[PDB]
Amino acid sequence: ASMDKVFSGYYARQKLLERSDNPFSKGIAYVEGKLVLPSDARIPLLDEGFMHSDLTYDVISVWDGRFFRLDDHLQRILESCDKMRLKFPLALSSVKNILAEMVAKSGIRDAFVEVIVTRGLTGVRGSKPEDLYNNNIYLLVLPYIWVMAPENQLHGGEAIITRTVRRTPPGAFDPTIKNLQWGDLTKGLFEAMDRGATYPFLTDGDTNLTEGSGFNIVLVKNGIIYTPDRGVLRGITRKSVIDVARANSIDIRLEVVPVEQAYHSDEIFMCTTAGGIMPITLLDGQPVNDGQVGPITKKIWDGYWEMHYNPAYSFPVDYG
Amino acid sequence: ASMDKVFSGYYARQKLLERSDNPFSKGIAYVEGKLVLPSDARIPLLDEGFMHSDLTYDVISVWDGRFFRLDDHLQRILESCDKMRLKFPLALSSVKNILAEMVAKSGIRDAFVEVIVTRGLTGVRGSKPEDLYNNNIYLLVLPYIWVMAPENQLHGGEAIITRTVRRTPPGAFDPTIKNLQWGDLTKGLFEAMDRGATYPFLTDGDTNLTEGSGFNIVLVKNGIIYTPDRGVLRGITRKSVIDVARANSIDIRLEVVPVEQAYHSDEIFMCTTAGGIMPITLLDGQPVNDGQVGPITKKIWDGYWEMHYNPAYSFPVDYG
Ligand SMILES: Cc1ncc(COP(=O)(O)O)c(CNc2cccc(C(=O)O)c2)c1O
Ligand SMILES: Cc1ncc(COP(=O)(O)O)c(CNc2cccc(C(=O)O)c2)c1O
Ligand code: NA
Helix, strand or coil, X not given: CCHHXXXXXXXXXXXXXXXXXXHHHHCXXXXXXXXXXXXXXXXXXXXXXXXXXXXXXXXXXXXXXXXXXXXXXXHHHHHHHHHHCCCCCCXXXXXXHHHHHHHHHHCCCCEEEEEEEECCCCCCCCCCCCCHHHCXXXXXXXXXXXXXXXXXXXXXXXXXXXXXXXXXXXXXXXXXXXXXXXXXXXXXXXXXXXXXXXXXXXXXXXXXXXXXXXXEEEEEECCEEEEECCCCCCCHHXXXXXXXXXXXXXXXXXXXXXXXXXXXXXXXXXXXXXXXXXXXXXXXXXXXXXXXXXXXXXXXXXXXXXXXXXXXXXXXXCCX | CCHHHHHHHHHHHHHHHHHCCCCCCCCEEEECCEEECCCCCEEECCCHHHHCCCXXXXXEEEECCEEXXXXXXXXXXXXHHHHHCCCCCCCHHHHHHHHHHHHHHHCCCCEEEEEEEECCCCCCCCCCHHHCCXXXXXXXXXXXXXXXXXXXXXXXXXXXXXXXXXXCCCCCCCCCCCCCCCHHHHHHHHHHHHCCCCEEEEECCCCEXXXXXXXXXXXXXXXXXXXXXXXXXXXXXXXHHHHHHHHCCCCEEEECCEHHHHCCCCEEEEEECCCEEEEEEEECCEECCXXXXXXXXXXXXXXXXXXXXXXXXXXXCCCC
């Protein structure tokens, strides 16, 4: 729509949500068949999701009461489960119905929605017959989380190329399997803090860019968009960027992206479900190009948010 | 020490434990200052130890009523906490007393003891360092767990050098920080199963051996012991192996160990807190040397178990 419009709508819905007396206005979780407040939600200590981070997950947004690309996210987590040798425990029809019920019960119009699938009590129940405790699922709905707050998207944020950490390589863990084994990404966040920046861009250690702590990385040079094609999550936001680029006849290249290229970029942005299209205007303490949010970034930002109202990519939740 | 002495004592103590009606005879945990049955124990869904596996841990054994090298393990977890910017949340003297008291209450004489320290309820992303020191602790005591059961230790087990996975590199996560981000190790276990073996030995992808799924790797060739010096946990069992080798004037080399050397070894064993000294007599489906448990492995095994009764390395729990 326009930075102003998208954000003003959000802030108006937030004012209403903050005045709600519904206890679920702060969020709602599904654990062991029960709906509970997130602060009250408790998972088994012996769950392998905790004991060995033996899990996959996914995160979907609701924006202005409309789920965005829920089907794409659920297909991705099904693929993640297959790669992990996990069985996704709920039929997709029913997980969609339960999530929509949870969102409706909360009254939250702008939501962060997390789905976690773990290997359950497989470790402690080895001797036991195969049953429902071999794969566990947890669902969480919270007010929308911003990796870059709206006010900061206006002028862009500050990134570093990490030098104390590199991305877990695919031979150690396939990064197309969304996962919570964030040891590298967490370290990256601390390195950024130490260096006076916010957003860590991790390399593969072999001179190319990968991704960061909750986002994919996109470079813009001479009217062409570039984003890494290996070593990263195949982001649904990135998928949407590709859709917008193609609709605008902007060439977009999924390929290996050398670290060097970031230092000459015309524009840089990050992309994620938790915040959308997030400009980067400082890199390693120096301006990206002129230090301004660039025109291609703005076109992608606008097209991205317009997609949230397109019925091919979204549907409205029934708040009753 | 003596294979049949050590194991016969264990089986006798087990028979007695299995007769008990003490509620905690199957284990006991300590969660939010409260004691809890392991199957009842719960952690907050929002704990960052779950949400981003943002934690370190350690595992200690009790053998025949005696804690083994508890001080070394607690020193290691303090070091791990320092490296992760976690503040270990209880005095070390309190944790030692609580763990001994848990063991006493359970009546378990041969125990697996786990200590987990997580980031807590506030995640690193978007936070200031000063808001990240309210860190959580979880303690767990279970009947002793065997990475290799006693009957199998008599003849040795079956390993593979993994080809579908390699160890998370130190640049992605420091392997001297004991952690539960087991994506590689878990995959290794599946690879071993697929290939008809049990124990995965992960390389660093750069042609050297690292460690496996809960153990360090030790090779023996021409009377000399070899074990990797980087890319791995500095195991307390490995430290005990070095103590026993020195006491026996057996040369031990901590150095880079090429994958190739495993194929020519006179003997191979794994070492871990959960089972001790565990011979490997088949590698990639072929015998290790003559396929028998070797004489140096046996000398290490004997000395290891002897250390469990040495007051320099152990102390008795007071069961009342
Ligand atoms: C490593 C990584 N890479 C890329 C993305 C972007 O993927 P999507 O475009 O499909 O969302 C992510 C997204 N991961 C994610 C999404 C939303 C919130 C948070 C959080 O840490 O608060 C993390 C991620 O964690
Ligand atoms: C990766 C790794 N490397 C080496 C060791 C051996 O370290 P110690 O000699 O200090 O124990 C470990 C040990 N880790 C460990 C120990 C006991 C049980 C389990 C389990 O998850 O069942 C894991 C480990 O997990
Ligand atoms: Na389940």
